Nucleic acid binder design. Structure first.
Ligand code: ZN
Ligand code: ZN
Length: 246
DNA sequence: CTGGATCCAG
DNA sequence: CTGGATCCAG
């Protein structure tokens, strides 16, 4: 098994000046080159929409693509529609593909569906109406941005599948309880290095209070959330309010 | 006390 | 059943 990072260069020539070129090329690449980031199965199945599923584990993936520079936002459709889906916990997993002017994939990631929170949905050039949206990847923790290819480097599929499976417990939490765990992961991402203290986490109290406005016991909530993450092997407790990222 | 463990009103 | 609240060991 060898991933080829370039698109089909013959299709590049055939579909020159064709309106659908960029969709044909990206879908083709995902179909032949991607694997299921849950169970590792290759190839995926095709379901207009660029939707795939895994015939082994039934995971679904919808593809989004951007030519050029890696963006911290993924273009979607309507704000209201995306919201209904997010609320109903109904989104597919998302594949995000970025590619160069020479039709090489330089980033390819999966955003597992449960990491798409109301918060991560931002309005695009909003107008009083007409309001598109993006998914804002700066609001998604590293645990929910799982790279199959990163900066032109093909990652170990065993690490991809491990990371994907590690986050699946969040599918069993309801919206706000899931939101808590996801925001704690966002805090931990900001801590520089491997080691951190409870004191480090308490610095985010003000930030967390602004998201979770009804919580008057934020320090205690932080402790509980750290315990959930320990139980899920995402951090370890070294005792006495000291932790290490895993 | 500090911080890991558990709970319950609506 | 949830997520803000309370319990409880060292
Ligand atoms: Zn190539
Ligand atoms: Zn699969």
């Amino acid at each position: 098994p060898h991933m080829e990072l370039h698109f089909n260069l013959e299709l590049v020539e055939t579909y020159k000046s064709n309106s659908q070129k960029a969709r044909i090329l990206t879908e083709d690449w995902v179909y032949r080159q991607s694997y299921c980031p849950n169970c590792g199965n290759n190839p995926l199945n095709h379901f207009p929409v660029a939707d795939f599923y895994c015939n082994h584990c039934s995971e679904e993936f919808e593809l989004k693509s951007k030519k050029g520079n890696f963006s911290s936002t993924i273009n979607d459709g309507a704000y209201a529609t995306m919201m209904k889906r997010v609320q109903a916990d109904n989104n597919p997993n998302f594949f995000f593909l970025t590619y160069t002017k020479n039709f090489e994939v330089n980033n390819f990631l999966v955003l597992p569906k449960q990491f798409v929170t109301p918060k991560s949905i931002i309005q695009r050039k909003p107008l009083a109406g007409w309001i598109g949206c993006n998914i804002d990847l700066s609001q998604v923790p590293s645990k929910g941005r799982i790279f199959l290819v990163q900066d032109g480097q093909v990652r170990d599929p065993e690490k991809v599948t491990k990371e994907f499976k590690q986050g699946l417990f969040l599918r069993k939490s309801s919206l706000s309880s899931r939101g808590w765990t996801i925001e704690i992961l966002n805090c931990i991402d900001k801590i520089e290095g491997s080691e951190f203290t409870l004191e480090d986490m308490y610095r985010f109290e003000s930030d967390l209070k602004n998201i979770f406005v009804k919580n008057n016991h934020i320090k205690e909530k932080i402790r509980q959330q750290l315990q959930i993450l320990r139980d899920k092997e995402i951090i370890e407790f070294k005792g006495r309010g000291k932790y290490r990222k895993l």
